[PDB]
RNA sequence: GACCCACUCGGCACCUUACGAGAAAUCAAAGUCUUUGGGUUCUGGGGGGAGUAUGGUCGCAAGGCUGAAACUUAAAGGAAUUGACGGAAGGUUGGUGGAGUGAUUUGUCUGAUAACGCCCUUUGUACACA
RNA sequence: AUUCGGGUCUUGUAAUUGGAAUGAGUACAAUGUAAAUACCUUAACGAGGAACAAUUGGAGGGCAAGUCUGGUGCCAGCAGCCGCGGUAAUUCCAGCUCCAAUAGCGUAUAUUAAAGUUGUUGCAGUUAAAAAGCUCGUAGUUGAACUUUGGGCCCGGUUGGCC
């Protein structure tokens, strides 16, 4: 997204989707950003730090965003079992 | 019958004749540089058009190609010797950009004004079309020309006609002889 | 349609209207001078109120 | 696959279909049938020169209520009975019964101009002078 | 005199704009935060100028006689790379126009402008072949080389000049005489530039943290008695 | 033999979405088409003139099949929308927000709630000086 | 830049005015040429206004420019299309002013583009024109997959930077 001599042009680098990698865009209001806080031993939330997930508008419209979110959070490592890869 | 002397028109008319944006903007150029018709502007934009399409045709092929190199270097060098494109952007991608203003600047009508001495551009045009001024030894009588860079410093008044030297003229002959000297019988 | 018609009025209006003459004036300077003149009246100062301008203003 | 055959070796059906289906548009029909030369008053030419027959008073269509003042003209070349409008204000009193006049078509290419039924031609010259020159008081009509 | 300015920052963006926490519109574009108030994008970037486009009357038969209204298509923009198209209908002309401008300011969208083929200083054309539809009118925008100009219909051309798209080819289909549809199609097309993966955009960034969460305690919907 | 439960192939269609498509009404296909190529037969190019004339060919006949032009006109239609009308059925207006590409509609409603602060409704319409 | 010294550049409007430069054109001579005419040259002449004057179409919208002035009163006419004209015409007839192109513009008929209104690229066929009553079937068009990849060994030219 650059010119010839370094200098990065192309204003605003879009957000990729977490689920399908489709570009969520400026006008699109159906898209969502989920923020999950970082737990540890000694309990409690610990504000400041977030594991983020950008769900697209289409994914939410179609109505299988839930499944995608179950998948995404699992590989990060905050769900023992829950969602089977197999079916 | 012999072979024909070939010919082709230099002006190229626009598509939409009545348009508010084009008519207002193009007439300013005509007023500044002192162009008598829109035909001249269209001619300049036709030459420019040809250059543009040529450049595009050069660019569709790959770099380090025999066709693209040679033609590019000669096109660019032609645009340099006339002085439209300066030395900084000698890249072939820049000749696509360009503008009509530069071309009109490079015309000999206004290069007399850009030097000076002729006061107004209109006055300069008059001087040119009335057989005054010269590129070197060779006299020029045409507003449109394209001065070829090296020729710039040699532009001055011609040996024939006043300012450069020689005789005064007609009106001065009549004032000096028929009026001033003729008072004494 | 019908071929018959009142042809007596052929050139009714061209005749009865008052045949006055052209007024003589100062000479319009032609060619490049005309272009100069156009450029001057347009791109100097005088225009109508609002963003839009009337190049031929009616006296009012 | 969108109706038509996109076969590589099926050019025949493509070109043939197109040739069959060209017969629809005006210009293709007018050219290939030879309709300008066979039919129509003029012989596919711009200006056809003619004599006259009589002056007319054409009853114009609604809403444009007037009388148009045309001329019935017999031509030289074929000698077909034609109707032809006379331009400008006045100017029917210039032409008379029997007079060499050079006609032109209106603009619309066949059929009516605007509100005049049947008439598909105007004029250009009468006695080889031009109506436009006569209306504007420039030139003089010869007596014969 | 007895006057006062009165901005009145309703919603969560107003306070941010007034306080001056967010400087640019880039953040807004990233996180798709819906601009409700028109005054957000005004003072956020004062360089955002304007434009009109077209006015046509729209009528309405009724019992008594006949109602009439004026529709104004108001396209607004700025020569860097942001544009808005605002259609509005009202009984007064000025009222239609002002409201249209407001609507255009509300819904602004940026344009991913790139190069024809070679890479050089400053983008000029569109990045990709984009197309937008509205009714019969499908408008297509094809990238053009340097100094080629905006080869299009006068309305679409104006829309593109507002954006600061210097050089671009166009086509269209359907009954293009209606600007109601055509300019909407153009808007859809220039909008879909950012919704298209080039290879340079596959380099996956980390997902920026939403700025709403950064300054939630500082500047947001406060209680406040008087 | 029948029925119930779960699965299964082949259709008959159906109900809900709109992912998409469509100018719309609408469509699980009229989708997978300007980001315009799965294969392939048939038909159309403004409306009248005319499914007429002329020609052939088919048939006992009626007609079918194939099927023009000159001339004429600035429309013709399609969908939906507001009224208006019916010798059809029953008993006021913007602000902001949605529903729509708009016309506009919703609000300003069945007797609660996509809304928040002679008259009417639904349908039919080739009328729209009604 | 001694802020109270006089005029270069001037944005336009002014028959107020003073010179200056020319051509178009007339022509000694020469050149040019088979021989001339032109051209190119150039003695002697030849600008300050009816001078040595540029027009051709438009001025409702499309399309740029007029709700200016008088005549005409659905008449004459304009009008490629929509439509103007029934006595206040921003469309007719004139005149004022303005706009376009400008020694060149307008008008016809043919044709190319726009016409993705012929469509292979690239149309449409539920209701707008259009899917043939349905099936068979010869030509024509099209028609599953599958029949040696990989691994190395060197030889070795082309790109760009420390060398």
UniProtKB/Swiss-Prot annotation, chain B:
Gene Ontology MF terms in the entry: rRNA binding; structural constituent of ribosome
SMART domains tied to this protein: Ribosomal_S4 (SM01390), S4 (SM00363)
Principal location: cytoplasm
InterPro entries (alphabetical): Ribosomal_uS4 (IPR022801), Ribosomal_uS4_CS (IPR018079), Ribosomal_uS4_euk/arc (IPR005710), Ribosomal_uS4_N (IPR001912), S4_RNA-bd (IPR002942), S4_RNA-bd_sf (IPR036986)
Keywords (A to Z) from UniProt: Cytoplasm, Isopeptide bond, Nucleus, Phosphoprotein, Ribonucleoprotein, Ribosomal protein, Ribosome biogenesis, RNA-binding, rRNA processing, rRNA-binding, Ubl conjugation
Misc remark: Present with 106000 molecules/cell in log phase SD medium. There are 2 genes for uS4 in yeast.
Protein name according to UniProt: Small ribosomal subunit protein uS4A
Taxonomic placement: Eukaryota, Fungi, Dikarya, Ascomycota, Saccharomycotina
Gene: RPS9A
UniProtKB/Swiss-Prot annotation, chain C:
GO CC terms in record: cytoplasmic stress granule; cytosol; cytosolic small ribosomal subunit
Cellular compartments annotated: Cytoplasm
Disordered: annotated span: 1-34
Keyword Phosphoprotein: yes
Residues modified as Phosphothreonine: 47
Main location: cytoplasm
Modified residues (Phosphoserine): 15
Disulphide-bridged cysteine pairs: none
Main function: Component of the ribosome, a large ribonucleoprotein complex responsible for the synthesis of proteins in the cell. The small ribosomal subunit (SSU) binds messenger RNAs (mRNAs) and translates the encoded message by selecting cognate aminoacyl-transfer RNA (tRNA) molecules. The large subunit (LSU) contains the ribosomal catalytic site termed the peptidyl transferase center (PTC), which catalyzes the formation of peptide bonds, thereby polymerizing the amino acids delivered by tRNAs into a polypeptide chain.
Note: Present with 37600 molecules/cell in log phase SD medium. There are 2 genes for eS30 in yeast.
UniProt similarity note: Belongs to the eukaryotic ribosomal protein eS30 family.
The protein's name in its UniProt record: Small ribosomal subunit protein eS30A
Swiss-Prot record, chain D:
GO terms under cellular component: cytosol; cytosolic small ribosomal subunit; ribosome
Family statement: Belongs to the universal ribosomal protein uS12 family.
Pfam family name, one: Ribosom_S12_S23
Cited SUPFAM superfamilies: Nucleic acid-binding proteins
Annotated effect of mutating residue 63 to A: Lethal mutation
Cross-linked sites for Glycyl lysine isopeptide (Lys-Gly) (interchain with G-Cter in ubiquitin): 55
Entry keywords, A to Z: Cytoplasm, Hydroxylation, Isopeptide bond, Ribonucleoprotein, Ribosomal protein, Ubl conjugation
Molecular function in Gene Ontology: structural constituent of ribosome
Signal peptide range in chain numbering: none
Keyword Ubl conjugation applies: yes
Subcellular location: Cytoplasm
Extra information: Present with 10600 molecules/cell in log phase SD medium. There are 2 genes for uS12 in yeast.
Protein name: Small ribosomal subunit protein uS12A
General function of this protein: Component of the ribosome, a large ribonucleoprotein complex responsible for the synthesis of proteins in the cell. The small ribosomal subunit (SSU) binds messenger RNAs (mRNAs) and translates the encoded message by selecting cognate aminoacyl-transfer RNA (tRNA) molecules. The large subunit (LSU) contains the ribosomal catalytic site termed the peptidyl transferase center (PTC), which catalyzes the formation of peptide bonds, thereby polymerizing the amino acids delivered by tRNAs into a polypeptide chain.
Sites of 3,4-dihydroxyproline modification: 63
Top-rank taxon, per record: Eukaryota
Post-translational modification: Hydroxylation at Pro-63 affects translation termination efficiency. The stereochemistry of the 3,4-dihydroxyproline has not yet been determined.
Any GO BP annotation: regulation of translational fidelity
Swiss-Prot record, chain E:
Post-translational modification remark: N-terminally acetylated by acetyltransferase NatA.
A GO cellular component annotation in the UniProt record: nucleoplasm
A biological process from GO: ribosomal subunit export from nucleus
Gene3D superfamilies from the UniProt entry: 3.30.160.20, 3.30.230.10
Subcellular location: Cytoplasm; Nucleus, Nucleolus
Subunit structure comment from the entry: Component of the small ribosomal subunit (SSU). Mature yeast ribosomes consist of a small (40S) and a large (60S) subunit. The 40S small subunit contains 1 molecule of ribosomal RNA (18S rRNA) and 33 different proteins (encoded by 57 genes). The large 60S subunit contains 3 rRNA molecules (25S, 5.8S and 5S rRNA) and 46 different proteins (encoded by 81 genes). Interacts with snoRNA U3. Interacts with MPP10. Component of the ribosomal small subunit (SSU) processome composed of at least 40 protein subunits and snoRNA U3.
Covalent crosslink: Glycyl lysine isopeptide (Lys-Gly) (interchain with G-Cter in ubiquitin): 5
Function: Component of the ribosome, a large ribonucleoprotein complex responsible for the synthesis of proteins in the cell. The small ribosomal subunit (SSU) binds messenger RNAs (mRNAs) and translates the encoded message by selecting cognate aminoacyl-transfer RNA (tRNA) molecules. The large subunit (LSU) contains the ribosomal catalytic site termed the peptidyl transferase center (PTC), which catalyzes the formation of peptide bonds, thereby polymerizing the amino acids delivered by tRNAs into a polypeptide chain.
Protein name in UniProt: Small ribosomal subunit protein uS5
Domain S5 DRBM, chain residue ranges per copy: 48-111
Keyword hit for Acetylation: yes
Principal cellular location given in the protein's record: cytoplasm
